Design a protein around this ligand. Structure first.
Ligand SMILES: CC(C)CN(C[C@@H](O)[C@H](Cc1ccccc1)NC(=O)O[C@H]1CO[C@H]2OCC[C@H]21)S(=O)(=O)c1ccc(N)cc1
Ligand SMILES: CC(C)CN(C[C@@H](O)[C@H](Cc1ccccc1)NC(=O)O[C@H]1CO[C@H]2OCC[C@H]21)S(=O)(=O)c1ccc(N)cc1
Lengths: 99, 99
């Protein structure tokens, strides 16, 4: 698809056998969801650093479907106020910015 | 241009008779630069809200050139750690996300 930016670019995601809404965020290195059960072994990760750190669970090699397109990558699970699709996943779907 | 997302999408901006680097950020509603002198009347604005607020100077109707393309819009000036081009400006240049 082609997504214009007059509204926040929030899209439907398939992840962990569930559906979630998430913000497509070119400003985010990583993809993070609030609390979802995912498969495999996780490890703790501290993220952020600008004013403090948030501890999250890092799951690698998670399949997601982002508005119809399949991606595999790292998904962080933790107490984010806003689910986010970051560049790690956007590269996998071939997302570009165009003007 | 077409910008891939394997690196942070940082681009050269012309603003206030100066050059700055800024992050193209689809996750940001607004455009914010660290401290730059701009023309016109500003007003204070509190931004954020997620953990606290940052007070910034809001300048309206500021021309910028974002990798070659002219945009006019609101520019916030304040103590951001990272200069950001947000959706307010991205819509003016016709920036889209495509996959
Ligand atoms: C890490 C996520 C929970 C949230 N994100 C913001 C985060 O990257 C901020 C971005 C940031 C940049 C400049 C100034 C303030 C915040 N950086 C940061 O270090 O925040 C710290 C704040 O306390 C800790 O808890 C979260 C991470 C740690 S994000 O995915 O990029 C993001 C960015 C903007 C929006 N609207 C929604 C999500
Ligand atoms: C407002 C700017 C200074 C910074 N931005 C982050 C900001 O939107 C966070 C985004 C955010 C989202 C979820 C969790 C934490 C932070 N939201 C927020 O309310 O932050 C508050 C923190 O203290 C105050 O100072 C800054 C604004 C106030 S941002 O332009 O979207 C931005 C986002 C990510 C990066 N890497 C760089 C910039």
């Amino acid at each position: 698809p082609q997504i214009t930016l007059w509204k926040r670019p929030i899209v439907t995601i398939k992840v962990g056998g569930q559906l979630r809404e998430a913000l497509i965020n070119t400003g985010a290195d990583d993809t993070i969801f609030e609390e979802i059960s995912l498969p495999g072994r996780w490890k703790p990760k501290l993220i952020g650093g600008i004013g403090g750190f948030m501890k999250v669970r890092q799951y690698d090699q998670i399949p997601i479907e982002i508005a119809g397109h399949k991606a595999i990558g790292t998904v962080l699970v933790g107490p984010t106020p806003i689910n986010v699709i970051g560049r790690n996943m956007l590269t996998q779907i071939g997302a570009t910015l165009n003007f």
